[PDB]
C-alpha cells in the first residue's frame, strides 16, 4: 500500500540529514583559513 509514503519520508529524512553536513562543511572550511 504505502511504501511510496515511507519512501518519501526516508527521502526527506536524508535531505534534512544532508542539511547538517552541508551546514558543517562550510563552517569547517572557514575556521582553518584564518592562519595567514
Amino acid at each position: 500500500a504505502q511504501v511510496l509514503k515511507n519512501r518519501l519520508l526516508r527521502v526527506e529524512l536524508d535531505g534534512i540529514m544532508r542539511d547538517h553536513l552541508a551546514r558543517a562543511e562550510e563552517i569547517r572550511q572557514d575556521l582553518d583559513a584564518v592562519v595567514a
Binding site: 515511507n6 519520508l9 526516508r10 529524512l13 536524508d14 540529514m17 547538517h20 553536513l21 558543517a24 569547517r28 575556521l31 582553518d32 584564518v34
Partner: peptide
Amino acid sequence: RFVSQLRRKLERSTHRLIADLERLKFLYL
C-alpha cells in the same frame, strides 16, 4: 595556540552526531 582545540572537540561532537543521525535512520526503518 587555542584554535586547534575547540574546533577539534566540536568536529568530534559532530562526527559522533552524524553517526547518531544514521542511528536514528536505522531507528526509523
